[PDB]
Specification:
The structure is a homotrimer.
Chain A lengths: L7 E11 L2 E10 L5 E6 L4 H15 L4 E3 L9 H9 L3 E3 L3 H19 L5 H15 L9 H5 L1
Parallel strand pairs in A: 1-4, 4-5
Antiparallel strand pairs in A: 1-2, 2-3
Helix pairs in contact in A: 1-2, 3-4
Bound molecules: calcium ion (CA) (3 copies).
The site of one calcium ion (CA) has 5 residues of chain B, from β1.
Protein name (chains A, B, C): Pol polyprotein
Organism (chains A, B, C): Human T-cell leukemia virus 2 (HTLV-2)
C-alpha cells in the first residue's frame, strides 16, 4: 500500500508459545519494503507496546501511517496519545499475517537447530535472515536494501 | 557551528540522580544536525569517558572537532592522548546544556510512565525519541535524517 | 580482491586466550572495504558459526562470495547448506590474517587500559576503533565510510 519506505506500516501483537510460556511478539512491517522489526515481550501493556514501537522506529525510521487491529495494545490511551504527540496517524483497519508466519517459521527453525541458546538469540537470527539475507525477487534486493 | 555533520561536536558529562544513585551521563551532540549519543556510566574515569566517546562515534561517525568543558573527564592524559592518536582536535571552550535538559526530561517521563523497567531501557527510549521521532521543524526532518 | 563492498569476504575462526580461557573469535572482513565484524564465542559448532556469520551480515550486508580455511567451522554440512540456501558461494581457498592481528592488538590494549571491564566491552571498543576511527589513508576514509 505504501508508495515509499515509511509511508505506511502495519503492526500486530501475536503470541508465540515457547518453553511453556506465551510471549507477545510485537511486529512492525513496512508495507512498501517489507522490512520488519520484532520485539519479544512478557506483557502487552502500553509500556511494552510503545517500547516495541520505538525500537521499530529506531531500526526502520519514523512512519507517517500505521495500521493495526483492535487489540488492547493499540486501543490504550497511552499509545493513541503517543501517536498523536509525534504526528503518526493510526488507523485500526494480510501482510503482518504472513510476516508473523515467516518470523515464527524461522524462530521454530533456529530454536530447533540450537536448542540450548536463548530466545533473544533466535529472534535476532530470524530478523537478520528475513531483512538482510532473504533476496526478495525479482529485483534481487533484500528488504533492508529496498528500505534504505 | 558545524557546517556539516561531524564537523564539530560538543560533549559533556552531567549527573543524573535516580533510585538514590548519581549516574554520569556522557553526552555527545553534533552541532550541525543536533544528533545525540548518550551513555550512562557509574564512573567518569578515562576508561568510561573513552568508552562513551567510541560509542558516540559508533552511532554518529568520526568527528573532526570536539568541544568540552574542563571537567576531569576531558582533562585526563588518556583522553587527550586518545584524541591526538586518532586525529580529533579537542578544545575545552548552550547546545549540550539544552540537550542535557531535553534528555533528562525524557528520562524522567519514561521512568514515570514505566517505573518497573531498568534505566537502560529509558535511555534507549529517550535517545530514539530525540534522534528519530522528534521532527525538527521547519525542515520536517529529524536529527537522524539530517545527520545521515 | 572484491571490486565492490560485499563482492568478496574472507572469514576465519581464531583463538584468543584471556583470563585462562581460549575464546573463538569468528572474524569476517570485506576484501574491498576492509570493514570487519568480530564475534566472541565459547564454541565453534555450526550454531555459533552461523550465528557469527549472520551478525556479520547484519552489520555489513549480504556477501556474494566468502573465502575461508578448511577449519571444522566452515566444513560442517549445516554451514555449507546454510550458504547454498541463501545464494552465498563459499570457497575454502593474508587479509584475515592481518585483520586478526590488528583486532587482537586492540583487544590486548583495551583490556590493559581497563582491566576490570568485561571482554565484550573490549571487543566493541576494538571493532568501533577499527571500522570507524582508523582513517585508511590516503583516501582519508575509514573502513565504515568506504563500505557504506
Ligand atoms: Ca493481534
Ligand atoms: Ca560537566
Ligand atoms: Ca582458523
Amino acid at each position: 500500500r505504501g508508495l515509499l519506505p515509511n509511508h505506511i506500516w502495519q503492526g500486530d501483537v501475536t503470541h508465540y508459545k515457547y518453553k511453556k510460556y506465551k510471549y507477545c511478539l510485537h511486529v512492525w512491517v513496512d508495507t512498501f519494503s517489507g522490512a520488519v522489526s520484532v520485539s519479544c515481550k512478557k506483557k502487552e501493556t502500553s509500556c511494552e507496546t510503545i517500547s516495541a514501537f520505538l525500537q521499530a522506529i529506531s531500526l526502520l525510521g519514523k512512519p507517517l501511517h500505521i495500521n493495526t487491529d483492535n487489540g488492547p495494545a493499540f486501543l490504550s490511551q497511552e499509545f493513541q496519545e503517543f501517536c498523536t504527540s509525534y504526528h503518526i496517524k493510526h488507523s485500526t483497519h494480510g501482510l503482518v499475517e504472513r510476516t508473523n508466519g515467516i518470523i515464527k517459521n524461522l524462530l521454530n527453525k533456529y530454536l530447533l537447530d540450537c536448542p540450548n541458546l536463548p530466545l533473544d538469540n533466535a529472534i535476532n537470527k530470524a530478523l537478520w535472515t528475513l531483512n538482510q539475507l532473504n533476496v526478495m525477487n525479482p529485483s534481487g534486493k533484500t528488504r533492508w536494501q529496498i528500505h534504505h
